[PDB]
A and B are shown apart, each in its own frame.
Chain A
């Protein structure tokens, strides 16, 4: 029962020009600033896959039990 909260929020700036090599040298500027002062962030995989496979198909049910 979600109302699907949606956002227009943007139109993508499609100026394909000298922009392309200008953002590339900006990513070179981050390779001096990020990896040399402080970036040590990490995350862990396969925790959310772990709970799926040992699942039921042994669901226990009291007296007036519904069943398809």
Chain B
């Protein structure tokens, strides 16, 4: 301990501020010049950030705190210069003069008068002088002012431009990772008036830099991955004009302002769709801006590009609408017959060959309901041009043999055989159409809507299936005709055929399953306007469901189209609309949780997730509202599948422990459909946690509840090694887990993982994270499986052809105009880089190296090299344009 002898600064700045009350009065020079000699020297012993220990700043205030309490207030005759010497010298040590209740008094030295241009003695120092202290002001002092009194005094007026120059100072001194400290400053200051802060910070960023935009640009969208309702409403529209005004990267408009379509205003992204039609230079970014506008996140854009430039600049519209759709058919025609696939594999059924010697002999299984699953050896493998003449003879015999619902099912499988087709898809049906039967034509003409699904061109808006519908005096002609056309025009929000198919609801012909899928057919069409659909559904709901207390054919189908007509907005007006509209008995207030959370597809709104638990948690509920706690858990399944894995680990942690562990009817009947809704990628955490409750069948219940959890355990696409689980459970599933009920089911689970080789993207995440619904086509099936008796009769309309929004697969094609380029692409396990050293290595799995149409996989941001510049949108999206430039030798 070598103290003493060199303690100059603990003596003379211990004495001269102690002599400052001894020299304020009767010493006009010593009041001023010793203050200025104190001020610059204390300023100089802080500017190097290589002596944090300052020989004054924690040496003078031991008496100087009681001094400043008697020097600044008690002088009472403060001059115009001596306030600029006192407050410039004594507002510096006040974060360390004072303890944690400094937060109310960062002003009793400073805001007496802020001396001039306080960064004048705080420019080259990063945060030790006042910039940490400036964040201490905006944390607590501005928030209590700007809680209800934003428009206020000097604590707002100068504080605006004070925070303005400080936010310039973060990107001024060193331009380090304190760029991201500016959104740390801009959002803590005036949390709800963020745009009033950001509007000055938009224009300041526009003149800040054009190279130091992009990491702050991704900092915003990382903060926009989850927020409050109003913060996600605010900072996402602040996110919009920064590649519009500062830079013109601008190919991140269409999908990354589909981010901002539903929250802020539907017309606002349509004004950004107008901003697409402003920046028409030249074609290449314009091409891939409008590639996504048809079948990547929405359709319904084919009405705004038939204006005055219909030569090539507005004749991309039909090219977008069906020709690049058919060029995507040329992927599955040309490229995917080249990689793997002849016309009929037909041998996953043949992969059940070694079972006949496992335990003696075989040929014991003769169940007639297995022949339902026999259609999927032909059915699922023949998607994307698995066209079959006389390979449908297993269909052709069984169509003309028995099983009326399988006559509808085998006829509905023909639409899956010719999918995404307009050229000759109806010609395939017509030879298998004229059998003059109810079940054959109702499955085939429903499959005609599946053939032209995603086309939305002129095939039959009211031609075929409207003529099929007006044939009705009877069975599924009444039913199966409205379903296929609303499936085909689900991407559109056309009003006309919605009003053609609204007298289906207004007929009051009391076929119950027809009116239920009528809500599902109109639900797939619209998500926004036409409140008269909500009027039309609840009229027959109050007519029919009020005079019953019975089955979920009422409940699983009629409120679901209401939720599909109001999907994806966290405004909480739609809950005020719907729940106050059907104020009713609790078995009709089953519908309370539907339209509540169908508007709540994905965000962070954890306050909803607690009312998704705390109202109907358990209660033990002796067989009265057990459907509602299942459906309340059904809406826990979404709002979990897109915070991008932040709550997915928390979802599998809660729902593994809480329900299947300490539950009853909520857990052991229904709570596995989360895993059939959360992901379809597959990973051995949840893929092995389900046979913990499946190999233990727990047969005491109506075990098709647990065998429903068998079924969409294989609701993970992208074919895997999971055959080890399903075939070995199929071996114990032939004799035991009786083949009368689920011999269709286990092979439905077996044959669905290898659906084709490819085309597994059914998982509602495009580009990086945006939805692309999608949800309107899947969510009817997991609402349908509640629970039994639709394994035989009614759910066979659903279980085959429920979800049909598969968009294509792979990010391999090049499309440089003649379509001859391949690439040198380099596929890897996805990004982790958030803020690290510049530049940041995007990925980590350098081993795989392909050129052309190779796979997507679970976490793959595939990059490219060889100086082709890949300049298009720099995110990805499976129709890259790929120009050419090499000006770096």
Hey, which bits of chain A sit against chain B, CB under 8 A? 13, 15, 17-19, 21-22, 24-25, 28
B contact residues around A17 at 8 Å (CB): 606
Is the beta-carbon distance between A21 and B191 smaller than 8 angstroms?
yes
Other-chain residue from A15, A21, A28 in contact with B610 (beta carbon distance below 8 A):
A15
Residues of B133-188 whose CB lies within 8 A of A: 147-148
Residues of B577-619 whose CB lies within 8 A of A: 606-607, 610, 614
Interface residues on B, range: 10 to 19
Is the beta-carbon distance between B230 and A25 smaller than 8 angstroms?
yes
A contact residues around B228 at 8 Å (CB): 18, 22
CA distance in complex: A24, B191 (Å) = 13
A contact residues around B690 at 8 Å (CB): none
Q: Closest CB-CB distance, A10 to chain B, in whole Å?
A: 9
Q: A19-B607, A22-B607, A24-B147 are in contact. List 7 more A-B contacts (CB 8 A).
A: A13-B614, A15-B607, A17-B606, A18-B607, A21-B191, A25-B230, A28-B148
Does B799 count as interface, using CB distance less than 8 angstroms? no
Is the beta-carbon distance between B610 and A25 smaller than 8 angstroms?
no
CA distance in complex: A24, B610 (Å) = 18
Sample (17) of A-B pairs whose CB atoms are under 8 Å apart: A13-B610, A13-B614, A15-B606, A15-B607, A15-B610, A17-B606, A18-B228, A18-B606, A18-B607, A19-B607, A21-B191, A22-B228, A22-B607, A24-B147, A25-B192, A25-B230, A28-B148
Residue of B nearest to A18 (CB): B228
CA distance in complex: A2, B464 (Å) = 73
CA distance in complex: A21, B191 (Å) = 10
B contact residues around A22 at 8 Å (CB): 228, 607
Most chain B C-beta atoms within 10 Å of own C-beta, residue among A13, A18, A19: A18
CA distance in complex: A17, B605 (Å) = 12
CA distance in complex: A18, B228 (Å) = 8
B contact residues around A13 at 8 Å (CB): 610, 614
B contact residues around A24 at 8 Å (CB): 147
CA distance in complex: A15, B605 (Å) = 13
A contact residues around B230 at 8 Å (CB): 25
CA distance in complex: A24, B143 (Å) = 13
CA distance in complex: A24, B148 (Å) = 10
B contact residues around A15 at 8 Å (CB): 606-607, 610
Residue of B nearest to A11 (CB): B614
Q: Closest CB-CB distance, A54 to chain B, in whole Å?
A: 48
Q: Closest CB-CB distance, A37 to chain B, in whole Å?
A: 15
CA distance in complex: A2, B610 (Å) = 36
4 tightest A-B CB contacts, nearest first: A19-B607, A13-B614, A13-B610, A15-B610
CA distance in complex: A25, B230 (Å) = 10
A contact residues around B147 at 8 Å (CB): 24
Q: Closest CB-CB distance, A22 to chain B, in whole Å?
A: 6
CA distance in complex: A22, B605 (Å) = 11
Q: Closest CB-CB distance, B234 to chain A, in whole Å?
A: 13
CA distance in complex: A25, B147 (Å) = 9
Q: Closest CB-CB distance, B605 to chain A, in whole Å?
A: 9
CA distance in complex: A21, B610 (Å) = 17
B contact residues around A25 at 8 Å (CB): 192, 230
A contact residues around B148 at 8 Å (CB): 28
B contact residues around A18 at 8 Å (CB): 228, 606-607
CA distance in complex: A27, B614 (Å) = 22
Residue of B nearest to A28 (CB): B148
Residues of B495-530 whose CB lies within 8 A of A: none
Q: Closest CB-CB distance, B722 to chain A, in whole Å?
A: 38
Residue of A nearest to B148 (CB): A28
Q: Closest CB-CB distance, B423 to chain A, in whole Å?
A: 54
Q: Closest CB-CB distance, B227 to chain A, in whole Å?
A: 9
Residue of B nearest to A12 (CB): B614
CA distance in complex: A17, B147 (Å) = 17
CA distance in complex: A25, B191 (Å) = 12
Q: Closest CB-CB distance, B226 to chain A, in whole Å?
A: 11
Q: Closest CB-CB distance, A29 to chain B, in whole Å?
A: 10
A contact residues around B192 at 8 Å (CB): 25
A contact residues around B191 at 8 Å (CB): 21
Q: Closest CB-CB distance, B603 to chain A, in whole Å?
A: 13
Q: Digit string of B226-239 for contact with A (CB within 8 Å is 1, else 0)?
A: 00101000000000
Q: Digit string of B186-216 for contact with A (CB within 8 Å is 1, else 0)?
A: 0000011000000000000000000000000
CA distance in complex: A22, B191 (Å) = 12
Q: Closest CB-CB distance, B576 to chain A, in whole Å?
A: 11
Residue of A nearest to B229 (CB): A22
CA distance in complex: A2, B87 (Å) = 70
Q: Closest CB-CB distance, A55 to chain B, in whole Å?
A: 48
Q: Closest CB-CB distance, A28 to chain B, in whole Å?
A: 8
CA distance in complex: A13, B609 (Å) = 12
Residue of A nearest to B227 (CB): A18
CA distance in complex: A23, B487 (Å) = 41
CA distance in complex: A35, B610 (Å) = 30
CA distance in complex: A15, B610 (Å) = 9
Residue of A nearest to B613 (CB): A13
CA distance in complex: A27, B305 (Å) = 46
Q: Closest CB-CB distance, B646 to chain A, in whole Å?
A: 15
CA distance in complex: A25, B193 (Å) = 12
A contact residues around B607 at 8 Å (CB): 15, 18-19, 22
Q: Closest CB-CB distance, B695 to chain A, in whole Å?
A: 36
CA distance in complex: A15, B148 (Å) = 24
Residue of A nearest to B604 (CB): A18
CA distance in complex: A13, B228 (Å) = 19
Q: Closest CB-CB distance, A26 to chain B, in whole Å?
A: 10
CA distance in complex: A19, B191 (Å) = 14
CA distance in complex: A10, B397 (Å) = 62
B contact residues around A28 at 8 Å (CB): 148
B contact residues around A21 at 8 Å (CB): 191
CA distance in complex: A26, B148 (Å) = 13
CA distance in complex: A18, B191 (Å) = 12
Q: Closest CB-CB distance, B231 to chain A, in whole Å?
A: 9
CA distance in complex: A53, B607 (Å) = 51
Q: Digit string of B654-680 for contact with A (CB within 8 Å is 1, else 0)?
A: 000000000000000000000000000
Q: Closest CB-CB distance, B879 to chain A, in whole Å?
A: 39
CA distance in complex: A24, B230 (Å) = 13
CA distance in complex: A54, B607 (Å) = 54
Q: Closest CB-CB distance, B525 to chain A, in whole Å?
A: 32
B contact residues around A19 at 8 Å (CB): 607
Residues of B101-141 whose CB lies within 8 A of A: none
Residues of B25-65 whose CB lies within 8 A of A: none
Q: Closest CB-CB distance, A23 to chain B, in whole Å?
A: 9
CA distance in complex: A68, B254 (Å) = 92
Residue of A nearest to B230 (CB): A25
Residue of B nearest to A10 (CB): B614
Q: Closest CB-CB distance, B621 to chain A, in whole Å?
A: 15
A contact residues around B610 at 8 Å (CB): 13, 15
CA distance in complex: A30, B360 (Å) = 76
CA distance in complex: A15, B614 (Å) = 12
